Every structure is written in structure tokens, then in C-alpha cells.
Ligand binder design. Structure first.
Ligand code: A1CLU
Length: 165
């Protein structure tokens, strides 16, 4: 099971960890991907998770988009977790660097409530351009299921813990 996490609330936990290495160790039921609407897993968490699957995540994702079309910003889909997890929940938070509505971040986190326990990154943070302190706040005030947050950047992790209300 999950180990070394700091408890933030009744149901939100956090750790300074690479989510790929955490997923390989834990093999959780659900790993969350910080996806875009096209499921094009180029960089950030998505590029790292896809590379760890030897591109099998991207091949599966291209078939999903060919059948269903793009996701909505704020939406999600459940696909295989490949060698990392049973399932991957691909969730699209708004990308501030592409000019998307930050109010859609709450809708993005609501997708987590469909799963009893998840390993996840902070949505819309990193290369998606939103303030990670805000993302953590929306996570705590939205998700009611058990979420284990993996924060890869050590300096960000320390800032998120020290500023957490
Ligand atoms: O936690 C971070 O440092 C940022 C915040 C938004 C997500 C990003 C991240 C998370 C896990 C990652 O695992 C490999 N690369 C990763 C990047």
C-alpha cells in the first residue's frame, strides 16, 4: 500500500515523489494522468506515464480518440493502467498557458469522486500554468474519495506543505 505520505485532511495525502516511480511501486487501482483533450501525452506527467508504458498508453489513447473524439476540458475517461496501475483515469484540467477557464479545475477534480482511491498529480499545475497552491486547495475542497498526491518537484512540495491551511 501507500507509504510515506503526509496527511493533509481526512481523505487527502501528499508525498514528494515521482508519480511514475510511485505507480511502479504501489500498482494502484487508479493512477490519474494530467491529460489534454486529445490524449496527446507529450510532456509533464502525461509524457512521463506514457514513456513508462513503452508508448502503449499513447496507442490505446489514439484508438480512443478515433472512436470518441476529444474529451472536454474538465472531463475524463478511464483507460488501461498498463504496467503502472489497473486503470488510468485521464483527467483534463484547464491549461492556463492555452487560455482556458480556471473555474473548470473544480469540474476536473470532481472526476476523482468516481473512484474510491487514486494516485494523482496536482491538476493544472506544472506546464498547465495554474498556481499549484490553488490546485491543492481545490483538490481538498472537491475530492471526497481517498487521494494520494505525488508532487515531483521537491521545492514545490515544501512550499505546498508550508503554506497549507
Ligand atoms: O508535481 C509536480 O512537480 C508537478 C505539479 C503538476 C504535476 C507535475 C508533475 C507531477 C508528477 C510527475 O512525475 C513526473 N513528472 C511529474 C510532474
Amino acid at each position: 500500500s501507500f507509504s510515506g505520505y503526509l496527511k493533509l485532511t481526512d481523505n487527502v495525502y501528499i508525498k514528494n515523489a515521482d508519480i511514475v516511480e510511485e505507480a511502479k511501486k504501489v500498482k494502484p487501482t487508479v493512477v490519474v494522468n494530467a491529460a489534454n483533450v486529445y490524449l496527446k501525452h507529450g510532456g509533464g506527467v502525461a509524457g512521463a506515464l506514457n514513456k513508462a508504458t513503452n508508448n502503449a498508453m499513447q496507442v490505446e489513447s489514439d484508438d480512443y480518440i478515433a472512436t470518441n473524439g476529444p474529451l472536454k476540458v474538465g472531463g475524463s475517461c478511464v483507460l488501461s493502467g498498463h504496467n503502472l496501475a489497473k486503470h488510468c483515469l485521464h483527467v483534463v484540467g484547464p491549461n492556463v498557458n492555452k487560455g482556458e477557464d480556471i473555474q473548470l479545475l473544480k469540474s476536473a477534480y470532481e472526476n476523482f469522486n468516481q473512484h474510491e482511491v487514486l494516485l494523482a498529480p496536482l491538476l493544472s499545475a506544472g506546464i498547465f500554468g495554474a498556481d499549484p497552491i490553488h490546485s491543492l486547495r481545490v483538490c481538498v475542497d472537491t475530492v471526497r474519495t481517498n487521494v494520494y498526491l505525488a508532487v515531483f518537484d521537491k521545492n514545490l512540495y515544501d512550499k505546498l506543505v508550508s503554506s497549507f491551511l
